[PDB]
């Protein structure tokens, strides 16, 4: 049954703020926290992600300094959230994965963990946990890796779900971003069951390049991922079948325990007109429309998740899911047999008839880890930057043996791509 | 008269009881409370209906039912649904986590906690039985408790009730409603850990139900309630013979005696016909007996020419003589290629029951004057074992997802084990089958 | 036509075109796999424990 | 986008379907253990039959008939002609043949029979062409009295192509080939691939063959001729179709069949065999492989050299 929601660092928790705005929306609650809907579909597993005549986020909100906490709260579903679930420090991590691992974050974390313990300890049954961060960052990407570790630690048999969001020279606040980006996807490969892997490089160029955005802010991108978080989670949170738990979800989509690793994307993004299912469908297995700057065509697909969201024919969602396949077969592995499932809510996105969101396990996903490994090599190789984090106790050594763990997820990757 | 006893395992299983139920209710002429107006021996008796049905002082005819699944949201439906005044809370059993869809979760991790209350919940009913013949095993091969937990509740049975039969009723995996990608996992290892515990097996392939229910009934894209429907009614004739008066498989022990004289090869094939749609001219015994010959009627897709015969049984429901009977199989035997093996005779038992089919108010089924089940033991069955086995070998091979079985304390070895004796099944088919 | 019996809900017959572990095991089996399930577990609390000493170290 | 696989390396026939169909610009061949096909161009022994048609979403179609090897095999062939009663012990045009429960004590009763009363026999399954039944699988009748061809006094086997498509309409291609000896008969009794004398390749085609036939017998090659064979054709066909027939099944199958005739020195015609997987003379291959691709796949998968045996 439950989820425990924890956002943490300054992108987690703008994108973390979207996600309830755009899920409370979807299930009928207003910023009070009062249902206000209309279809009994809307409540019937809200508890997944709501305590309870209001309704709470199960969220808890982390950060290392005050400041996006304070514009969360002034937000606009702001009050909704549980004001003990409040947890934040003063003195910031500066960019760093050392400062919210190991010194800042360290800290702040037992305050976390309390908070953690309580809220699940009013589960009648906990699967697991989904955290929304940054691996660019400090606080999201190094404190949120470290939280994870200790969750599992306290909690070694539920289900640990990210949404992280990884960095791009493109779209990029500081140089030492591969840094923390490569220390985190250290962590990620051994601690995470499931991770979507949003890029900002691909959410900056759907921006610019279909949506005609001329100049993206971080407001549309988190646009995007909220779109897209509230796609990917619609089976956690509404009536079905298929993937309905994370616990299912990950014995369906992760084949081998390392390779977790999913390219998310939605449809449509276009600059009134119906859309009919022929395009939904077209639109999502489209490059164009994923959101980790990776090519599907360079790689195969282990596995697939399809969810289509409103009206629309059942009977042909499922010939055009099978299109696809049969006209795209070397695409998917043929040796893990009928490898795409397809569910169907009923409900749409708000301002959308029809919606549809795909999770690809792809091979392809091996180029973001290769660019984030050639971005870390070209610093250091000249350990370039290096005294940021030396200067809070790490050693060069962790740095080495990071770079060697994703050049092995690489590898790992190559090697089903060609089997 | 002798008691049966019912188990429905995982949402399958639990779907399809529901399912079941409803349609014995219907039959029998008991109503959603429970009473049955046309029983004149209150609060007792020993009917043909009382092998499925105890009676309270009070008038309620109990289903002698168990339903086990390991997440709660579907048996609370059967709890809160039309039939609910017909259980008590002992026959419903929930755990709050599932399966996950992995066998080893349901057969280790989950089963060894909740095996022990499911088994008092049997004995409860089994305390209430002058002559309890055995159970029927209705579960999904896919699901990880339809999988991992009715293999462990088979041998555990074997154990406590060795002298009782039991049968199962078995949704094997179809891609076109499946949930999961490892359900050839989970089929290969409770067929394996099952196979020494079944007398006799009813296996439906989702493909075949769905299909049929697309091409006959008209629906474009089938529910399960659609397919239970249908299975129910399959399901009904071949148990109606311990419900009602009669002289053929008038209990659990003569399926095996009528349909299966090699223990291992224990999987008779279920044919159908007719089935006509409700929103849409009477077909003849001729035309339903010469449509159990054909595949697209058949709960296994599959081709009964290329195979041999082991036994075969014919079920009427409705107005049927023997002499239409028996001038349509002259006239079927000279036009199809009906091959038995040697050491077997050449020949149908048949049964007839005059009352037709049933089907539930405002369904999909159109009421028939006549219905016919065939049951038959052909080696052409293994086909679908075949499908399954090469489905299996393409992931193992890479040991996909084999992670999550050996991470809930499975040894990897428990797959090759039963691989191998799948392939050896395989073997025996075809050595029965030349 | 053999074994023909008939009464007031049916008929049957028969037709011929042609002639010719225990407890203790079980119990075992699922306390090994719960034992193999302690063990990566422990395995598991370990790999926490020396990254936890990591921590304290750094 | 139609999708096919390859499973016959070796089929000369296939290989030429394939160079076709990848020509249309509209097929793809996907890799062997690829699922996910229309086509199946299939391997010659255990062709998994059992995992077609259970692709959802997919019209799967296969170039072999399950059974059809009842017709295909020597033994197999012989007892289907004396159980069916449709083509029965008495059949007029398939020699008297024996399988060797072995019809051991019946052929030799039919042996001694004649002997008291031409005693010529052949064994095969390697063959023996004797006299004597201790010398002497199946055993059949040797045709002693063939129609040799002049000049040369050669025997010499008839080649027809039949495909039966997936509603088994039977198509005869009209073009078949003798093939010859060019030894003088009694290497001059078995006519199988002076070697080239007569003929390029020993073979002969039909209109050089009609020729003769009208030069030197005042007859057709229709007349005379494929009137028989096209009955054989057909009543061979015929008689498994409702064994081995693909319509009511969740897949499809056509076959090409090579069948081979001897014709005796009053044209009659007898059948000698069926073969499941012929090749083609080297001439026709073009021709009968694009009919193949017409009439077999593209009736079914939309982008007449043949006489349609009608039933
Ligand atoms: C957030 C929307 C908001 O702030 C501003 C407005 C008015 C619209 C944004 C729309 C948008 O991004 O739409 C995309 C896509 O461009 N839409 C279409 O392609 C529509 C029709 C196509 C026809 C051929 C879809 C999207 C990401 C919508 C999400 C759904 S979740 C809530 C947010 C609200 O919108
Ligand atoms: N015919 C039919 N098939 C069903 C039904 N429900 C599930 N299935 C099939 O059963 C398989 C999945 O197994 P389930 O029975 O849902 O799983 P379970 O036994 O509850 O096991 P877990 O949920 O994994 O604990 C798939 O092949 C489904 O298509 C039903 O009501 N009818
Ligand atoms: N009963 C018979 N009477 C006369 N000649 C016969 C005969 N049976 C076979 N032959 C001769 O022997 C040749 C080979 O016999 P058979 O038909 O068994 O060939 P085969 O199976 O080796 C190759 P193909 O498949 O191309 O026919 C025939 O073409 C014919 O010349
Ligand atoms: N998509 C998106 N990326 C953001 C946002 N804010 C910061 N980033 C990215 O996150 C990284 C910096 O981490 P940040 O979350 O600001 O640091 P933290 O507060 O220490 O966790 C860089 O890769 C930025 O491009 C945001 O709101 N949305
Ligand atoms: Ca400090
Ligand atoms: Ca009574
Ligand atoms: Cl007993
Ligand atoms: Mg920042
Ligand atoms: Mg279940
Ligand atoms: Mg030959």
Redesign the interface.
């Known amino acids: 049954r439950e989820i425990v929601h924890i956002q943490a660092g300054q992108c987690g928790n703008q994108i973390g703020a979207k996600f309830w705005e755009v899920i409370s929306d979807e299930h009928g609650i207003d910023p009070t926290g009062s249902y206000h809907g209309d279809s009994d579909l809307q409540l019937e597993r809200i508890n997944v992600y709501y305590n309870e005549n209001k309704y709470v986020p199960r969220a808890i909100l982390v950060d290392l300094e005050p400041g996006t906490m304070d514009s969360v709260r002034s937000g606009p579903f702001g009050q909704i959230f549980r004001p003990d679930n409040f947890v934040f420090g003063q003195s910031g991590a500066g960019n760093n994965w050392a400062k919210g691992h190991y010194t800042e974050g360290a800290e702040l974390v037992d305050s976390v963990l309390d908070v953690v313990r309580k809220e699940s300890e009013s589960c009648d049954c906990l699967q697991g946990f989904q955290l929304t961060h940054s691996l660019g960052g400090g606080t999201g990407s190094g404190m949120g890796t470290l939280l994870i570790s200790k969750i599992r630690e306290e909690y070694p048999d539920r289900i640990m779900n990210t949404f992280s969001v990884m960095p791009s020279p493109k779209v990029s606040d500081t140089v030492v971003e591969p840094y923390n980006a490569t220390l985190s996807v250290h962590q990620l490969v051994e601690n995470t069951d499931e991770t979507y892997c949003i890029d900002n490089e691909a959410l900056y160029d759907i921006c610019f390049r279909t949506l005609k955005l001329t100049t993206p802010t971080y407001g549309d991108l988190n646009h995007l991922v909220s779109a897209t978080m509230s796609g990917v989670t619609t089976c956690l949170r509404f009536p079905g079948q298929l993937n309905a738990d994370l616990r299912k979800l990950a014995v369906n989509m992760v084949p081998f325990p390392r390779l977790h690793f999913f390219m998310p994307g939605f449809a449509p993004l276009t600059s009134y007109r119906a859309l009919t299912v022929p395009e939904l469908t077209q639109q999502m297995f489209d490059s164009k429309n994923m959101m980790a700057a990776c090519d599907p065509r360079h790689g195969r697909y282990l596995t697939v998740a399809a969810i289509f969201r409103g009206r629309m024919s059942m009977k042909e969602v499922?010939?055009q899911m099978?299109?696809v396949?049969?006209?795209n077969?070397?695409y998917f592995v043929?040796w893990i047999?009928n490898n795409v499932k397809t569910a169907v809510c009923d409900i749409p996105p708000r301002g959308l008839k029809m919606s549809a969101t795909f999770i690809g396990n792809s091979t392809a996903i091996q180029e973001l880890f290769k660019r984030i490994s050639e971005q870390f090599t070209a610093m250091f190789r000249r350990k370039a930057f290096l005294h940021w984090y030396t200067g809070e106790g790490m050693d060069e050594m962790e740095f080495t043996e990071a770079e060697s763990n994703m050049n092995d997820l690489v590898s790992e990757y190559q090697q089903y791509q060609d089997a | 008269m002798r008691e049966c006893i019912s188990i429905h395992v995982g949402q399958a299983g639990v779907q399809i009881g529901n399912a079941c139920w409803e349609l014995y209710c219907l039959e029998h002429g008991i109503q959603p409370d429970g009473q049955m107006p046309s029983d004149k021996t209150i609060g007792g008796g020993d009917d043909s209906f009382n092998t499925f049905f105890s009676e309270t002082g009070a008038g309620k005819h109990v289903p002698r039912a168990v339903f086990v699944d390991l997440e709660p949201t579907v048996i609370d439906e059967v709890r809160t649904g039309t039939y609910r005044q017909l259980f008590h809370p002992e026959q419903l059993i929930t755990g709050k986590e599932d399966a996950a869809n992995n066998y080893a979760r349901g057969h280790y991790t989950i089963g060894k906690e909740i095996i022990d209350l499911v088994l008092d919940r049997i004995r409860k009913l089994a305390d209430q039985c002058t002559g309890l013949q055995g159970f029927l095993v209705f579960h999904s091969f896919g699901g990880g408790t339809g999988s991992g937990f009715t293999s462990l509740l088979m041998e555990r049975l074997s154990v406590d009730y060795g002298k009782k039969s039991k049968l199962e009723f078995s949704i094997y995996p179809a891609?076109?409603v499946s949930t999961a990608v490892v359900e050839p996992y989970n089929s290969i290892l409770t067929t394996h850990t099952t196979l020494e515990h079944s007398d006799c097996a009813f296996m439906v392939d989702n493909?075949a139900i769905y299909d049929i229910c697309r091409r006959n009934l008209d629906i474009e894209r089938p529910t399960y309630t659609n397919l239970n429907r249908l299975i129910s009614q399959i399901v009904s004739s071949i148990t109606a013979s311990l419900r009602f008066d009669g002289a053929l498989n008038v209990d659990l022990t003569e399926f095996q005696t009528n349909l299966v004289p090699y223990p291992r090869i224990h999987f008779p094939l279920a044919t159908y016909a007719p089935v006509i749609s409700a929103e849409k001219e009477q077909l003849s015994v001729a035309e339903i007996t010469n449509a159990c010959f054909?595949?697209?009627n058949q709960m296994v897709?599959?081709?009964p020419?290329?195979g041999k015969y082991m036994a075969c049984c014919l079920l009427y429901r409705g107005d049927v003589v023997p002499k239409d009977v028996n001038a349509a199989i002259a006239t079927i035997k000279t036009?199809?290629?009906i091959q038995f093996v040697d050491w077997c005779p050449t020949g149908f038992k048949v049964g007839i029951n005059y009352q037709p089919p049933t089907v539930v108010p405002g369904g999909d089924l159109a009421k028939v004057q006549r219905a016919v089940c065939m049951l038959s033991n052909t080696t052409a069955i293994?086909?679908?074992w075949?499908?399954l086995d090469?489905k299996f070998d393409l992931m193992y091979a890479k040991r996909a997802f084999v992670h999550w079985y050996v991470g809930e304390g499975m040894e990897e070895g428990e797959f090759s084990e039963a691989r191998e004796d799948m392939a050896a099944l395989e073997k025996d088919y075809e050595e029965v089958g030349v | 036509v053999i074994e023909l019996n008939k009464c007031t809900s049916g008929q049957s017959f028969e037709v011929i075109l042609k002639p010719p572990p225990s407890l203790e095991e079980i119990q075992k089996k699922l306390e090994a796999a719960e034992e193999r399930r302690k063990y990566q577990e422990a395995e598991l609390l370990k790999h926490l424990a020396e990254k936890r000493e990591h921590e304290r170290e750094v | 986008?139609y999708?096919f696989v390859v499973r016959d390396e070796n089929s000369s026939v296939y290989a030429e379907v394939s160079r076709l169909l990848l020509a249309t610009g509209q097929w793809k061949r996907?890799?062997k253990?690829?699922?996910?096909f229309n086509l199946m161009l299939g391997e010659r022994n255990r062709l998994?039959?059992?995992?077609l048609?259970?692709e959802?979403?997919?019209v799967q179609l296969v170039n072999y008939y399950?059974?059809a090897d009842k017709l295909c095999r020597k033994a197999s062939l012989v007892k289907l002609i004396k159980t069916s009663p449709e083509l029965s012990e008495s059949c007029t045009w398939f020699p008297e043949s024996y399988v060797i429960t072995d019809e051991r004590e019946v052929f030799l009763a039919a042996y001694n029979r004649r002997r008291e009363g031409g005693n010529v026999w052949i064994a095969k399954s390697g063959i023996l062409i004797s006299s004597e039944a201790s010398e002497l699988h199946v055993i059949q009748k040797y045709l002693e009295k063939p129609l040799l061809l002049e000049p040369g006094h050669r025997k010499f086997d008839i080649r027809s192509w039949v495909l039966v498509d997936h509603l088994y309409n039977i198509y005869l291609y009209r073009e078949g080939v003798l093939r010859t000896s060019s030894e003088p008969y009694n290497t001059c009794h078995l006519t199988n691939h002076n070697y080239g004398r007569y003929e390029e390749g020993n073979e002969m085609f039909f209109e050089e063959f009609n020729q003769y036939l009208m030069d030197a017998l005042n007859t057709t090659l229709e007349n005379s001729i494929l009137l028989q064979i096209k009955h054989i054709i057909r009543s061979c066909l015929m008689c498994i179709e409702?064994?081995?027939s693909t319509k009511?099944?969740?897949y499809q199958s056509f076959q090409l069949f090579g069948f081979d005739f001897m014709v005796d020195e009053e044209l009659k015609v007898w059948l000698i065999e069926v073969n499941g997987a012929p090749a083609c003379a080297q001439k026709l291959y073009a021709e009968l492989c694009q009919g193949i691709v017409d009439v077999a796949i593209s009736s079914v998968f939309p982008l007449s050299i043949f006489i349609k045996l009608h039933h």
């Open positions: 499922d010939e099978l299109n396949q049969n006209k077969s070397s043929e047999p | 891609p076109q493909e054909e595949p697209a897709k599959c081709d020419r290329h036009k199809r290629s293994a086909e679908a075949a499908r090469h | 986008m999708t996907l890799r253990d690829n699922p996910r998994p039959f059992g995992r048609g259970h959802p979403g997919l399950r059974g409702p064994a081995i009511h099944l969740h």
